[PDB]
Amino acid sequence: MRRLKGTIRHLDDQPWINVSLFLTLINGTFNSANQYPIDTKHAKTDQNGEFVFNVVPNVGIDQSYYILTTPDNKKHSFTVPDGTSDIEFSVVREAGIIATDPEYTNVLNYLEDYIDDAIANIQAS
Amino acid sequence: MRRLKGTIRHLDDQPWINVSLFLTLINGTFNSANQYPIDTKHAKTDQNGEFVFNVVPNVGIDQSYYILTTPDNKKHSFTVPDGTSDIEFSVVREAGIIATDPEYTNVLNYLEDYIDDAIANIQAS
Amino acid sequence: MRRLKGTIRHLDDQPWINVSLFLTLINGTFNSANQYPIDTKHAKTDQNGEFVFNVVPNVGIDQSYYILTTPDNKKHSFTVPDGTSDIEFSVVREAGIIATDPEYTNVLNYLEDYIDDAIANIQAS
Amino acid sequence: THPLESYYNQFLDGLPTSELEELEIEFVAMCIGFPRSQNNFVNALLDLSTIEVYTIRTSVKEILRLDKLNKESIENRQVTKVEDITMNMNYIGDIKDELVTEVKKLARILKLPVLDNLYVSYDDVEGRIGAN
Amino acid sequence: THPLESYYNQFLDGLPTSELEELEIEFVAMCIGFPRSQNNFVNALLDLSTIEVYTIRTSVKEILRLDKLNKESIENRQVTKVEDITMNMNYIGDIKDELVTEVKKLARILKLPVLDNLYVSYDDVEGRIGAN
Amino acid sequence: THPLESYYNQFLDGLPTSELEELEIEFVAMCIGFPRSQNNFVNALLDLSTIEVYTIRTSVKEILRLDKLNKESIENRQVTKVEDITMNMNYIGDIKDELVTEVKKLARILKLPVLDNLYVSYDDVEGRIGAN
Amino acid sequence: THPLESYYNQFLDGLPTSELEELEIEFVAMCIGFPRSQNNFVNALLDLSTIEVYTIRTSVKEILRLDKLNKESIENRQVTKVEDITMNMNYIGDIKDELVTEVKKLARILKLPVLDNLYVSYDDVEGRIGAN
Amino acid sequence: THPLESYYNQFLDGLPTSELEELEIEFVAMCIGFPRSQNNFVNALLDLSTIEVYTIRTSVKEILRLDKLNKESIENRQVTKVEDITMNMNYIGDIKDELVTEVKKLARILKLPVLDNLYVSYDDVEGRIGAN
């Protein structure tokens, strides 16, 4: 649930207020913890032109490809990296789709923990 | 019969409360001591967004195979592993979704490489 | 005669209570003592999904062919062998289908891995 | 793909006859205009025989098929008698009337009066519970 | 793949005159809108001569055939006089009229007052019982 | 198929003139709705002349043939003048008229009035007993 | 590129039945002129079943498609029977009728009265609260 | 190169949903004959939602397109049926009707009375304020 402290600003350098920004997920993403089906949500710029989104990183089969639609209706593609910290929009805006997080170790490691359970079942209780 | 658990939460990570979910076995299956025709079951998510289905360990004489339809109109295909124990829906939703990548000879090679990974783990074990 | 025994259960251990079934000696037959012309018999499920049919074993001079229709219309052919004792439906018919698809054994390979683990444990000693 | 479309596509050999599904129950509720919580509606949902269930299912399959057909045709009517094939301009009216007939068939299967729903208009019985 | 269609598919040298199975009794009940439990209905089900049963089964088979034929034909009517083959634009009307004719034929066989059902409309004598 | 169909198929050299078999009596009762129990009907069978028997069987055979033809013809009526052959759109009506004429012949041979039965509809003669 | 158009383009296989996005709610209010503040409107969203939501989304997609086709087709109508293709001069009327049908279906799914909106004018029910 | 057209052609992927610029507001004011300074007009300009603005801009673009198409086509009507292409003689009437439809659509979006403007005639409801 990384924040996104993105801020928009008019050409005159004043901010936009109560203007709709749309954020859309493309691939139904999921992790061992939970599942994140394809959903979209909007936000309104504050009186000062800031806007915040709480988003999930990309750990699914396909990257949890996010798109931001701005008031001009341009579509900006991007891919939330992993971590826990408020993010500025532009930094991920310039960064398109990337290789997201390490390859599978967690599920097979859970299987291997089950194998360890079996190992403990070999002799002892 | 195993229990398929699943945590579904919105893009903001808040849970979906009392939202609809459907599941259905595609082909009737029969065990040596009972016959299970096709059936469909509906469910709703709790306050925490969780949902649990009592489901057959589907291994059987005939083609046993489940499809779960989520609120995003998306149908995920998966077959339940045998056993008597609760399983998190993500595990099958990913393992059953490797049926994707038609003729997954590349992912079949990865399956063999995972057998090798288990072999090396045992060797270290 | 024989008491064809059968049990139907829902996807989640609930007996298939109060549903209909039909069986027909599709090929009208006869025996020296009596003649058994083509006919259809209907029945209903009990609170446990059990159902019993008093049926003539296939010892007809020419042919005695039975066909049973499930709630899903998965018409299963069979021919009750001679004898007087009862017999379960899973046995009278058997006659499983090839169940050929990428998603039939997709997880049966996982159970194959589990039995590989079991043999590894056994040979560990 | 409509949910019911896939669900029924699962059963190539005829249609299942066990019981009405909450999805099918909701669909009939919607296309007859009954909120499914009505006591009379649920009462009608009991005692219905198997062949009645089969007829309901084929009728709803017909409803879906005709509804889909209503969409692709509208791209036509842009033309009449292209080279020799004259067009039955009332095709739209025909399919609308067919949908109305199917809804009436549902209403008669349930033994209930057909109320105000999307497909039918001004031809309804006893309003909510009591009327006309 | 209708249950009665499958049941009939077995008999090729004719349709058996044994009696009316619960499924076909139920289907007839639905076709004339009579709840099968109604005393008058079951009483009429008694004293059935063999050829009466044969005719009833033939009429039921015809009902099924006409229903399927309507399902097929609805797609037609898209056009009229494709090259030189003009289309009977009331063909669907003809099918419906023949269907209601068969329904009334059944009702006449059972001497019962044809009532509100899925096929006939606005001409259902005596309603449920005694009054229409 | 139809029992009477086979029974008559046996008699290639015309049809017998002995008397009306139980199936024939049953089908006559069906065609004019006179339950064979009704004495006013049974007495009619008595004293029935030979040539009358032959004519009755001829009429019954024709009724069966016309019924089969009516069932078959419905596949037509889709179109008109496919290449140069325009078809009588009233053919089915002609078949119905012939059927009612045949049942009227049946009733006439027995000096009995036609009642509401399988074929004749809404134009009945002297009801169940006495005028309508 | 309408926003909801792309939003639906994402949902390639059918459409979700989760809720109505603020854009979808706004578009509905636009179609039937119900400001979202109206409790009589918001309560309609409450207790709104799933298949109902699917139908709403289907109707909205149809509204968008038909509206776009309306603007597209205007450049036609310049001529009649260019070579052998005579075109329905009422085609625009046909799509107008389709659009009003769609908005009426919308209003009826929510059991709400269709008021003066951008697509229907002076042919509507109940106006503000009880106007008509 | 209409100023509004030169503003719009930049936003190829849909149209912006920010707000109405003084140019867009001026154009709308002209199209419904409302001087901008009118208090009711500006008050209506508030409470504007996203899809409302988007549809307003789409309708304005359509207004411009049809207006240009009118001057394009007026050269036509000089002839009829060149070789086989008959000419829709009321086509200009269709253009006018669609244009006034768009103007009324805008009026409904703003909930404001449509008054005497440059496009529509005699559809002047309750004058500047209530008048006539």
How would you classify the helix and strand content of chain D by structural class? mainly alpha
Question: Tell me, what's the shape of chain A?
Answer: elongated
Radius of gyration of chain A: 20 Å
Note the beta-strand portion of chain A. 15-25%
Distance from N terminus to C terminus of chain D (CA atoms, Å) equals 38 Å
Which oligomeric state applies? part of a larger assembly
Order of helices and strands of chain A, N to C?
Answer: EEEEEEEEHH
Content of β-strand of chain D:
under 5%
Which term fits the overall shape of chain D?
Answer: globular
How many strands of chain D?
1
Radius of gyration of chain D: 17 Å
Main interface: chain pair and counts: B-C, 44 and 34 residues
List the helices and strands of chain D in order.
HHHHEH
Largest sheet of chain A: 4 strands, antiparallel
Helix segment tally of chain D: 5
Count the strands of chain A?
Answer: 8
Give the N-terminus to C-terminus distance of chain A in angstroms. 40 Å
Write out the strand line-up for the largest beta sheet of chain A, numbering strands in chain order.
5-2-7-8
Q: How would a textbook summarize the main sheet of chain D?
A: none
- Class per helix and strand makeup of chain A: alpha+beta
Q: What is the number of helical segments of chain A per DSSP (H or I, 4+ residues)?
A: 2
Structural summary, described in words:
- Chain A is built from 2 helices and 8 strands; from the N terminus they run E-E-E-E-E-E-E-E-H-H.
- Chain A has 125 residues and is an alpha+beta fold.
- In chain A, the strands form 3 sheets. In chain A, strands 5-2-7-8 form a 4-stranded antiparallel beta sheet. In chain A, strands 1-6 form a two-stranded antiparallel sheet.
- In chain A, a hairpin with a 5-residue loop joins strand 7 (66-69) and strand 8.
- Chain A starts with 5 loop residues before the first strand and ends with a helix.
- With 132 residues, chain D is mostly helical.
- Chain D is globular.
- The longest helix of chain D has 25 residues, at 50-74.
- Chain D has helices at residues 3-9, 22-32, 39-45, 50-74, 91-109; one strand at residues 86-87.
- Chain D is 52% helix and 2% strand.
- Strand 1 (86-87) of chain D pairs antiparallel with strand 1 of chain E, so a sheet runs across the interface.
